[PDB]
């Protein structure tokens, strides 16, 4: 369940993969792990599927209610604090989830929330079982002066390097790009395949 | 001697307190709306007030969702409480079924809430009427919800002090499936013929939706065309 | 001086508030129905209203289940709440016993719910009468439930403003086991003889069921034959 | 000025509301019953009504169990609620002790339930009187339960509008241990002498039980013999 | 203007509703009793009624336990509820302490229960007075409990309509430690001198207990001796 | 028009219902008491009644503990409930602190209980005044608790119908630290000067305690000395 | 407890078998595992029998209530979301079930729901103890261009290949075909026997 | 017609019941107090009563803590309940924060408690005013809390029947930072000029605190100096 | 005859009790405020009272947060309770979202709390109006909340007895984006033209905030400049 999200100068790039497996047996080869919860905000879930989808519905409804009755979008730190309180009220009967929240209000932010409720902002983050391989790739090639195209190439390279050594990850790659000018944009499948072909990878 | 309690019938069999709520609705300004070829609109009269008031908070039309919206008339406090309850019930429906599938059960929640207070002592009813309108899985919708909880789906209506005159005009002039502009101008004439003599129609807030799109509120200069 | 509380008896021993609910039922339009050779039908008069109203939501006849259905007369808000309670009670009976085995206990739940509010202070009764009809394990059924909760199984009845005249006609004309068509035309004549002079019978909603089949509502042109 | 609340005493010390429930009982039709040599019977007058009414649901006599049964007089809604409570209390007694051992504590449950509403404000009493009768471990039983909860075991009684005349007849004519037929004919004469002049006794529902047997209801042609 | 609520004092400081319960007790028939040399008895007047009534259920004297017993006067429904509460409280006392050690706390439970309803609005008091009598660890006991909850242990008393005349007789004639028979005849003369002129004393139920024995009720022919 | 509710103030600012409890206390017989050299006593007048009454249950003086005791005046039912609450609060204090350390908080529990009913609607106050007296860790104590809950520690007091005359005598005659006998005779003279002309002082119950000892009640012949 | 459900162009084919066994001992050789919960919707239960039948009754009543009071059928994704919430409210005192929901609203859908509440849409799905054998057959012969008759042949071939290697499955084969034109149609026993005879299988 | 409920406004908008509590405060004796150079004092007038009363329990000044203290005026029962609530709230504040940090939130607890009863039906307000005074982390404090809950921090005040005259004197004579003695004598003159003609000022209870010290109550002979 | 309950409509459809709360607001002193170029201010008139009162507790302007603040007019007890509820709701909003993001939902909590008491019997409304003002994520804000709960965002307003005259002045004189000083002097003239003849404007409390800064209250000598 490899997830990744990096920041740039006025852009957030968040990418996942798609394989649902809870055995040594592959149930589904095409799942959803990357969601849109506001106009300029996304969220990647990784962990237990049911609890993840319930948290997704609860966050989408409450963000939409706040946006309608205040006529402004909710800030990203307020989103992370609200979700931290929601996870930490039930810390003894917990949720088995591990999720990321990224967005743009005046500057790009990425928050990383664990199953007890601790949210820590960092530049780049990665959750899942392929997270050490993703942190190994991003430790040696990430730079703050990169452009949007180089970032899209980097997250594809990182997930495609995590797919080779982790048995629980695989499939096509979702990529979404968040910008203040263009909003939440999810890149098409043929464009992702063109990226993979021009880099020199398989599947 | 019987118009003092919400729970007592007259020897005719009327509920005078329920009807006095219907008299309290009548003191609010006129607001109309109707459906057309792929969508529904809403028109609301506003006698323009003090320029110190921020115009964002005198809008009788309010967006409950990106796909449902409504307008009120009557007591302003009860009106605000009701549009809040409509928003919260829309969110609960959307989370239990995945989406706002039908507008009718949102209107049902609001209707049962308004109906319950017309039965028990120690509570007064809401003196507000609401006109819901939007797009669902079926298509364009248009309701009205009165103080007693009675809901009815229409093709054209009004509420407020002018209601009888506007529905009298629409009862003899309205023809369905007009393209959006012609529909709006027919509704403007409907709003015009409800005023009293000497009164000039000021600028009314008007908004609409079409099948496959979200709302938009015509700003005051797009409104200004149809004066 | 005693018609003010639901909980006080007159020195005769009458409940005047309960009877004012009977005066509130009398203001609704006439609706009748009877059983015949393998099945039961229902007829409901409607004085046709504004063409802006969507016809799906003025039907006095309502399907509670595929095998039970009913019709009301009286206050429209209480009528809607009652048909909702009938639907939910049918679902509860169907899930606890596997199927709607008897219509009588559905009618019993509605009857006890309507009866309870004629006993306690701080609550007013429902001003609605309901006529249930359908097919069960036994066969064709036909009840009426009044505001006080009294239920009685009939072979032919009416409710509403015309009730006395229609049951007076059926009391001297109705003969059982008619084939469906002849039954419907007898019921149409029953509905005709309850109007006042000069009034022309407009098109009434009529629907029926036979043993082994579901409901169907005769559409307006199958209705139009028997005018 | 004191006959308005269930909880207030007159300076004599009377409960006028409790007595107005007794005036409400007096408006129901006459029903009698008595025990005989190994068993008890029940007779109930019915002024025959509309032929559209199914005869299964106008029976004033009702079977609470295979070995207990009763008959009412008064308000029809309260009467139905009371016979329902009698059935449920019979089932609870039968499951906690293995069988309906004594009829008296079934009558006690009904009596305490009817008594409780003659003490608390915000509740009106039941306007129904009930005559229980059956076979227990002791033998033939016969009670009557009034609106205030007073129960008394008799050998012969009536309730309803004729009660004084029938108990006046039985007080000077009844002799115990009659064989069933002679008992029934004595009870028919008792029912006859309570009507007014010109009134002809129509067919009354009559049913009985003997020691070691269940109930049976005499059908209308076995009734027709004793006219 | 103050005899309408149980919770309001007069400017003298009287509770008129509590005293109207005393006027309600006064309508019941006379019942007396006193202690003697090792034991206590009870006498209860009964104006003989309809022969259809089973004599087991008109006994004003009732056995709460094998060693305590009582007699009432007033409202029959409240009387029955009170003797039931006396039985249940006797059982609770007997199970928490192993035996009914003192009769006084049984009378205390009944007294506090009757007292509580003379203080709170929305409840009317019990219109019954009770005379307890029995044998405990101390010996012969004799109480009376009035509607307000006041209990007083006596050596001789009465209740009912004759109470003043019987206690007036006993106040000038009663001498303690009579052997049982002489005591009963003194009590019969006490009951005789409370009737009005022309009235003949019918057969009263009389029962007694001695130290070390249970109750027994003198049957009607042992009663018949002292006429 | 204001003496009807416990919760309403007059335009002066008086609580007339609370004061009618003070009028209800005034109808009880006189009871006095005072402290002396190492201890406190209590005197209670009793107009001797029917010899049928067991003398153990007409004692206005009651032992709450071996070291605290009290006397009442007013309504007898409320008086009994109050002395019961005093006993139970004494037991709770004794178990939570090991012993009845101070009499003042026992009087506080009783005072707050009596005060609470003079504030809430739907409850009437207690029409009883109580005089507590005993020995604690501090020494001789003497309180009085009125219907409104006001407590004051005295050196000599009375309650009842004579209260003004006895406290008028004690206000001009009482001198502290008398040896027990002289104190009792001064209190007897105080009780004497409160009667009306012609009335002879019958035998009053008198009891006392000294520092380091328990109670004892002077029996009637030790009482008979000071007549 | 072999279940299977595949999609085609405007058709859903759902098939089960019938054997109830909770021991090494066969209780009943004829059970019900394929239900109809709406006009154009079916559901296969597999797991614990009691919890399965309770969920069946709860879904049938609520779908019928919604249909009566709205006059339109409930969409399949709304059915799966409702059932996911019903299973996930009690996730600590759970139901031991594993079920499939298939139907037609505008396009054929098949949802696969587990015991915690995670619903994932896929093209074909299979639950039970014979599910690896069914996924082995369907991996090598499934094609999207197949017709309705070839699909009916394929699910019979898959279940008859799972019946040979799994000891907990066996008996006759229920087959139901859902189409927008014809509605929920359950194929007769003699037609299923004709299919088995013309393919060349036994029992 | 509006001074009957605590919850009803006059057409001016006054709460007459709240003001009748303010008329009930006016019947209590005068008590004043003010701050000075490092500390605050309190003076309370007492018209000396019966010598039988122990002087420990007529003190209008009461120690809530070693560092906070107060004085009341009005109804004595409500006064006692309020000083009890002040003590308990002081203890709760002291245990949740380690010490009584600010006197203001103790006064806030008392104020909100007194305010709540001026809003809900079925409860009457407290007819008492309180003057708090003490030393906190900030320094000398002095409040007054009225029946409606309004608190205001002063430098000098009074309550009771004299309040207007004493605050009129202090409004034109008081100068801050007096050394303790001169302050007390100014306050004694303030108390003197509030009496009526002919009345001689008896001995008032006076007490004070300085920064870094506890309370002490001037005993009657230190009081006697300033007469 | 209808201005007695909060829950009853007039036959016009007015809530007279809600309007009498609006009459109770009118008795408080005038307080105004408006926004300007990057920020908002508040002005509150105070007729200067007794010098014994500590000036920290007569401030009509109160700091709810470092970034929101408000001012009241009407009943002082209800005013204090409302500003307390505003502070607590600000803290709850700040802890659930990390910061006070919008002032509008703080005003919403206060508005719904004040609205709820205008609907249920047994509760009276708050007789206070509040003017909120501060800086949020959006910028300068300015509301007013009336007794019925109606909130409206303004650019300039007043409350109190002068409200009509001050809003009449601001309606014809106010021009937006004034630099702070000129704005304050315009508001001082607005406060001046609301007094009656002969009255001299004393020193009013005035405070302000700018975008990126906290509050500060102009002390009395910075106030003294603009006299």
PDB file of N, CA and C in Angstrom, chain C residues 190-214:
ATOM      1  N   UNK C 190     -72.086   5.041  -6.849  1.00  0.00           N
ATOM      2  CA  UNK C 190     -72.077   5.373  -5.426  1.00  0.00           C
ATOM      3  C   UNK C 190     -71.387   6.708  -5.168  1.00  0.00           C
ATOM      4  N   UNK C 191     -70.280   6.956  -5.868  1.00  0.00           N
ATOM      5  CA  UNK C 191     -69.569   8.222  -5.712  1.00  0.00           C
ATOM      6  C   UNK C 191     -70.352   9.372  -6.336  1.00  0.00           C
ATOM      7  N   UNK C 192     -71.078   9.094  -7.423  1.00  0.00           N
ATOM      8  CA  UNK C 192     -71.894  10.100  -8.097  1.00  0.00           C
ATOM      9  C   UNK C 192     -73.036  10.599  -7.227  1.00  0.00           C
ATOM     10  N   UNK C 193     -73.714   9.687  -6.531  1.00  0.00           N
ATOM     11  CA  UNK C 193     -74.906  10.089  -5.788  1.00  0.00           C
ATOM     12  C   UNK C 193     -74.604  10.793  -4.466  1.00  0.00           C
ATOM     13  N   UNK C 194     -73.331  11.086  -4.184  1.00  0.00           N
ATOM     14  CA  UNK C 194     -72.953  11.829  -2.992  1.00  0.00           C
ATOM     15  C   UNK C 194     -72.656  13.295  -3.252  1.00  0.00           C
ATOM     16  N   UNK C 195     -72.507  13.696  -4.511  1.00  0.00           N
ATOM     17  CA  UNK C 195     -72.230  15.085  -4.828  1.00  0.00           C
ATOM     18  C   UNK C 195     -73.496  15.921  -4.665  1.00  0.00           C
ATOM     19  N   UNK C 196     -73.319  17.236  -4.679  1.00  0.00           N
ATOM     20  CA  UNK C 196     -74.431  18.171  -4.646  1.00  0.00           C
ATOM     21  C   UNK C 196     -74.850  18.499  -6.073  1.00  0.00           C
ATOM     22  N   UNK C 197     -76.002  19.159  -6.203  1.00  0.00           N
ATOM     23  CA  UNK C 197     -76.586  19.438  -7.510  1.00  0.00           C
ATOM     24  C   UNK C 197     -75.751  20.447  -8.285  1.00  0.00           C
ATOM     25  N   UNK C 198     -75.536  20.153  -9.564  1.00  0.00           N
ATOM     26  CA  UNK C 198     -74.729  21.006 -10.411  1.00  0.00           C
ATOM     27  C   UNK C 198     -73.298  20.526 -10.526  1.00  0.00           C
ATOM     28  N   UNK C 199     -72.813  19.847  -9.489  1.00  0.00           N
ATOM     29  CA  UNK C 199     -71.452  19.331  -9.502  1.00  0.00           C
ATOM     30  C   UNK C 199     -71.339  18.156 -10.462  1.00  0.00           C
ATOM     31  N   UNK C 200     -70.340  18.218 -11.334  1.00  0.00           N
ATOM     32  CA  UNK C 200     -70.047  17.147 -12.278  1.00  0.00           C
ATOM     33  C   UNK C 200     -68.884  16.340 -11.716  1.00  0.00           C
ATOM     34  N   UNK C 201     -69.009  15.013 -11.760  1.00  0.00           N
ATOM     35  CA  UNK C 201     -67.945  14.129 -11.301  1.00  0.00           C
ATOM     36  C   UNK C 201     -66.734  14.201 -12.221  1.00  0.00           C
ATOM     37  N   UNK C 202     -65.618  14.711 -11.706  1.00  0.00           N
ATOM     38  CA  UNK C 202     -64.359  14.711 -12.436  1.00  0.00           C
ATOM     39  C   UNK C 202     -63.760  13.306 -12.333  1.00  0.00           C
ATOM     40  N   UNK C 203     -62.546  13.134 -12.836  1.00  0.00           N
ATOM     41  CA  UNK C 203     -61.952  11.799 -12.943  1.00  0.00           C
ATOM     42  C   UNK C 203     -61.378  11.315 -11.612  1.00  0.00           C
ATOM     43  N   UNK C 204     -61.881  10.207 -11.029  1.00  0.00           N
ATOM     44  CA  UNK C 204     -61.362   9.772  -9.725  1.00  0.00           C
ATOM     45  C   UNK C 204     -60.273   8.711  -9.840  1.00  0.00           C
ATOM     46  N   UNK C 205     -59.290   8.724  -8.949  1.00  0.00           N
ATOM     47  CA  UNK C 205     -58.292   7.667  -8.972  1.00  0.00           C
ATOM     48  C   UNK C 205     -58.893   6.362  -8.450  1.00  0.00           C
ATOM     49  N   UNK C 206     -58.707   5.291  -9.221  1.00  0.00           N
ATOM     50  CA  UNK C 206     -59.263   3.979  -8.889  1.00  0.00           C
ATOM     51  C   UNK C 206     -58.185   2.929  -9.113  1.00  0.00           C
ATOM     52  N   UNK C 207     -58.098   1.964  -8.194  1.00  0.00           N
ATOM     53  CA  UNK C 207     -57.078   0.919  -8.225  1.00  0.00           C
ATOM     54  C   UNK C 207     -57.638  -0.352  -7.608  1.00  0.00           C
ATOM     55  N   UNK C 208     -57.020  -1.490  -7.924  1.00  0.00           N
ATOM     56  CA  UNK C 208     -57.579  -2.772  -7.513  1.00  0.00           C
ATOM     57  C   UNK C 208     -56.492  -3.834  -7.432  1.00  0.00           C
ATOM     58  N   UNK C 209     -56.854  -4.968  -6.827  1.00  0.00           N
ATOM     59  CA  UNK C 209     -55.979  -6.127  -6.685  1.00  0.00           C
ATOM     60  C   UNK C 209     -56.851  -7.368  -6.802  1.00  0.00           C
ATOM     61  N   UNK C 210     -56.278  -8.448  -7.332  1.00  0.00           N
ATOM     62  CA  UNK C 210     -56.956  -9.738  -7.372  1.00  0.00           C
ATOM     63  C   UNK C 210     -56.068 -10.781  -6.714  1.00  0.00           C
ATOM     64  N   UNK C 211     -56.656 -11.924  -6.352  1.00  0.00           N
ATOM     65  CA  UNK C 211     -55.964 -12.962  -5.592  1.00  0.00           C
ATOM     66  C   UNK C 211     -54.860 -13.588  -6.430  1.00  0.00           C
ATOM     67  N   UNK C 212     -53.619 -13.436  -5.979  1.00  0.00           N
ATOM     68  CA  UNK C 212     -52.469 -13.908  -6.712  1.00  0.00           C
ATOM     69  C   UNK C 212     -51.734 -12.854  -7.506  1.00  0.00           C
ATOM     70  N   UNK C 213     -52.206 -11.608  -7.499  1.00  0.00           N
ATOM     71  CA  UNK C 213     -51.608 -10.527  -8.266  1.00  0.00           C
ATOM     72  C   UNK C 213     -51.243  -9.363  -7.356  1.00  0.00           C
ATOM     73  N   UNK C 214     -50.477  -8.433  -7.909  1.00  0.00           N
ATOM     74  CA  UNK C 214     -50.134  -7.211  -7.211  1.00  0.00           C
ATOM     75  C   UNK C 214     -51.165  -6.136  -7.515  1.00  0.00           C
TER      76      UNK C 214
END
